[PDB]
Amino acid sequence: KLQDPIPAKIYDKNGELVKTLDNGQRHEHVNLKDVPKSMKDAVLATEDNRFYEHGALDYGFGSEGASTLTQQVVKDAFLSIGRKAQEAYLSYRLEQEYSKDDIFQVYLNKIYYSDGVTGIKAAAKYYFNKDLKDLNLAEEAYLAGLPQVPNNYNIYDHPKAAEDRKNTVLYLMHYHKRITDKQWEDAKKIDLKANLVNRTPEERQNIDTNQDSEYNSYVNFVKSELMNNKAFKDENLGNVLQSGIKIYTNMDKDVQKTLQNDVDNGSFYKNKDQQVGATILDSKTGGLVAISGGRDFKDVVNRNQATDPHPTGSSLKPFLAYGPAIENMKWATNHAIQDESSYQVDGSTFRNYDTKSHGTVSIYDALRQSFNIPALKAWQSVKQNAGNDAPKKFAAKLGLNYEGDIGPSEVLGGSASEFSPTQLASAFAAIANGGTYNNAHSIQKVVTRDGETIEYDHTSHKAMSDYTAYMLAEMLKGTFKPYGSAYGHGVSGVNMGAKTGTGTYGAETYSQYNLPDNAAKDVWINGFTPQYTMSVWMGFSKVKQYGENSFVGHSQQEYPQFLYENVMSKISSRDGEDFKRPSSVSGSIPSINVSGSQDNNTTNRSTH
């Protein structure tokens, strides 16, 4: 039974309107009291002159028991057995349960007027560039007539036909005594085409569906999260989005425009096939302030590449190796691990990216300049001292799950270590806020058509101890100091740290496609201040011969870092807020240890 489609409105963290989900569509809602008498008079004359009087028993099958006007509203909602008898009965029902105003209002809002226009208000703006108050009788007569058969009466294609339909409607208005002999006579002398908007046939078809395009990615996230609540996970998504709801979000309008403008206008693309995905969260709460799904992201046409999973490369070294060591065995940042030029785990050889050994290194130096081999050792040591599920458990509390056994490969970000920027941002935000985890969430509250304010909530619990969060925070500031993996892309004001990734190809792929030895496939920077967390991924829609669609060399692998720095430079607070130091730690970088747990296996050396 009927409803009055109004489209869903989205408000930002400040309750300012931002995006209405109307599409480009040519439709403007109008209340019944706001349509001029003469235009209502036109439609009744034309379609059912005794609309208000009529009841069922004033007599295809069913024809005479609803009014033709009601029946038009129902046909529409059905455009396969006996689908006209059904319309006839469904229409008797509507008249039993709604007023004639309710039905009239719906009719003036949904019936089609050709060329993509639904409802009378949009009709008058499109054809004559007029508000309803301004239409002359000829203009009204034609609009009353148009929708019986609208492609065949459209003035653009069929001028003669429109002229004769106008005349009929004027005739009927006169016949049903809704206009004087003197208006009828004046109305005939009017040229219908006088105010007809001058238009070419491409303009007739060009609807701009992609206005306010900087929000396209945000909107896509919201549609996915909207329906996860109790209230809605029974329902037709398309239906919900056309029933007056007001969604209030954690979007920051300005930060979202910055993000997407840089995604589109930046100079860090090698070619048309390079893709990107970015998510920015509020470190302290976990709220989605901005998201971007890629270059020129449109909603259903493109895959939102910030909610899709990707190989992670060295991005998880804090979570599956070094973090758990600090949490459980209580190692200092000073802690020494012996590096090798080759290391065997299970049944396989591993090497550092550069193929060299760097001596005995601190986990400080080994995290911040991202070494493979010592990371494997740290992991192995964890399994030997905290249990074989100790890495799994730690990742689990940070939203990073695995179905099978976490092997050496997934520690270096291969195999089943595929996660989304949004997932990784949430994990890193837990370092950035003293160690609590918040599932990424856009929605605060929804307000239904009629006030009933439905409430939202997010998975939120303790991830790590306070000392683990501080220690990792300060370790990962090093990634921006000389010889760090993001050396040169920091902001001079701001207390950020960061973990980069570089993901690779399998052996077969290098030879099949003749990739050079230094050709990478996925590249990330994960960064965070105490105010924002920002995770960026770039890869390529597909592999190409000789290296076209790879990040060949150090500086092609840096691309993500340029987006990060451009964006944080512009959105970060300048107060100089620092990470919150707890009383469970003592000393300072590179030599922070856990209070009352002196580490006995440490080194003094700096790698460069």
* Global geometry: elongated
The profile of the biggest β sheet is: 5 strands, mixed
Please report the first level of CATH classification, the CATH class of the largest domain: Alpha Beta
Total domain modules: 3
What radius of gyration results from the CA coordinates? 32 Å
Report strand %.
5-15%
How far apart are the first and last residues' alpha carbons, in Å? 74 Å
Relevant CATH superfamily of the largest domain: DD-peptidase/beta-lactamase superfamily
Question: How many beta-strand segments?
Answer: 22
Strand order of the largest sheet: 2-1-3-13-14
Query: What is the name of the CATH architecture of the largest domain?
Result: 3-Layer(aba) Sandwich
Written overview of the protein:
This protein has 3 domains: 99 residues, Penicillin-binding protein 2a (Domain 2); 181 residues, Penicillin binding protein transpeptidase fold (Orthogonal Bundle), CATH 1.10.3810; 325 residues, Beta-lactamase (3-Layer(aba) Sandwich). 36% of the residues lie in helices and 14% in strands. The protein has 23 helices and 22 strands. The strands form 8 sheets. A 5-stranded mixed sheet has the order 2-1-3-13-14, covered by helices on one side. The protein has a 5-stranded antiparallel sheet with strand order 5-4-19-18-16, with helices on both faces. A hairpin with a 3-residue loop joins strand 18 and strand 19. The radius of gyration is 32 Å and the shape is elongated. It is classed as transferase. Keywords: transpeptidase fold glycosyltransferase family 51, lysozyme fold, transferase.
